[PDB]
Amino acid sequence: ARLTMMWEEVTCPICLDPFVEPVSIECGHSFCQECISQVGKGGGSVCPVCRQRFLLKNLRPNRQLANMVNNLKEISQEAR
Amino acid sequence: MASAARLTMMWEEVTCPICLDPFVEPVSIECGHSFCQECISQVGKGGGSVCPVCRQRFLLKNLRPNRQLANMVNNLKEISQE
Amino acid sequence: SHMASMQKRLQKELLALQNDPPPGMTLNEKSVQNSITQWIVDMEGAPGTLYEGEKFQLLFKFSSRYPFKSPQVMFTGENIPVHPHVYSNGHIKLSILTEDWSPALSVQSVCLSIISMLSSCKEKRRPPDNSFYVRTCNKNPKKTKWWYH
Amino acid sequence: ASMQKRLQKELLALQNDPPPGMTLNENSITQWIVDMEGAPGTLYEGEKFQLLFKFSSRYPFKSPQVMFTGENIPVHPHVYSNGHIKLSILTEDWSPALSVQSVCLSIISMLSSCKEKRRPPDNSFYVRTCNKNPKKTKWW
Ligand SMILES: [Zn+2]
Ligand SMILES: [Zn+2]
Ligand SMILES: [Zn+2]
Ligand SMILES: [Zn+2]
């Protein structure tokens, strides 16, 4: 049968919603741009999941993740 | 079927564009596109080159692991051994 | 906007606790203030531990900056566990509530840590600073807290 | 193996889900032929063409050689008399992220590109260029 484990692993760990404009930090962990920039106020802080240090100087868009989240929104778009 | 196809949708989204297999040790270059570590370095003979997907210049020293992507491919490997 | 996104997260976390609570825990729904800032979790001590048979209650208080700041969490009611990291008035000594807090932690993860802390404990003792700490906590005028901000 | 693994996944993709207007004929994974029919709304509707795909050992990091073959060759400003295809993606716009499927789609996009069914300005010149060559005989 079907499973929604799909959705759990495209969920940002900060806002708990599907990633919007996901970015990676140095360690390679991904977050919504807005959520991790909330975390890194002042130009830096530590990773929510691994606590390795990061700076938003080196934000990198996660293009694979952006494309996948978008495509899955389409499949999940349903009439109510 | 009962959105069994959505299963395959996620499989193709976690397919590396170079080998056309699920990402193995996925890494990101500067533009933020993702590849198997070993495919992207097959490309980047010499220390750097151009992104297969978008043509942005990358250097192999700037590789970064895609922890989210590695994390999701095994959750799907787990699921399909039913 | 901040609080809209904070409400969204908190709503999803409350659904998870009602539908798949951690072992020995239950959320108290007779406390229905539209669950947007404080909720009470009934928790029972685990078998084979120093708290077998005991019924406790946990209070979760969420500030305006949750989840970037940690919630306030305490035992309340009149049965408060006797434990080296819990004060007589129910305050809890746990740094994931302090400097090991990260926004990626959840109510679920805090609940598991409290449970892990109860059943890890091998000595039913109060914290060494308890009488000092509670005497000072009974002299502070925080009575009406607007506190959510 | 990774190259043959890719080529078999691509070859199955063609047999089970070919691009619109395409079908393949005659199991040799170094070389395969795809039948192509003109689409409604283009100047090549109804005509039957054939594409040859040649894969080298460095595929997909070097581009396959792709050409029209047979005795029906389309008349098109980016397609020569001999079947060679003038498409930068076959040359230095090649990337390993391109596919047979994506190359097929680009050609279809090209058949429907042109407003006048014309031969390339280099056509008689360019194919006379290629008729003198030592040729890729036995090993390359
Ligand atoms: Zn987020
Ligand atoms: Zn991290
Ligand atoms: Zn690969
Ligand atoms: Zn790129």
Numbering used by the authors:
A (entry chain D): 5 to 84
B (entry chain C): 1 to 82
C (entry chain B): -1 to 147
D (entry chain A): 2 to 27, 32 to 145
Question: What did the published study say regarding this structure?
Answer:
TRIM proteins constitute the largest family of RING E3 ligases in mammals. They include the intracellular antibody receptor TRIM21, which is responsible for mediating targeted protein degradation during Trim-Away. Current mechanisms of TRIM catalysis have been informed primarily by experiments on the two antiviral proteins TRIM5 and TRIM21. Both proteins are dimers containing a RING, B Box, coiled-coil and PRYSPRY domains. Multiple E2s have been reported as partners but only depletion of the N-terminal monoubiquitinating E2 Ube2W or the K63-chain forming heterodimer Ube2N/Ube2V2 has been shown to inhibit the cellular function of TRIM527,28 and TRIM2129,30.
When comparing the RING in the RING:Ube2W structure to the apo14 and Ube2N~Ub31 -engaged structures, we noted that the N- and C-terminal helices of the RINGs are partly unfolded when bound by Ube2W. While this may reflect differences in crystallization, it could suggest that Ube2W has the potential to destabilize the 4-helix bundle, thereby generating a disordered N-terminus for modification. Even so, this is insufficient to explain how Ube2W can modify the N-terminus of a RING it is bound to, as it is located far away from the E2 active site. We generated models using our RING:Ube2W structure where the ubiquitin is either dissociated (open) or in direct contact (closed) by superposing on the previously determined Ub-RING:Ube2N~Ub:Ube2V2 structure. This indicates that TRIM21 RING uses a closed conformation when catalyzing ubiquitination with Ube2W, as was found with Ube2N39.
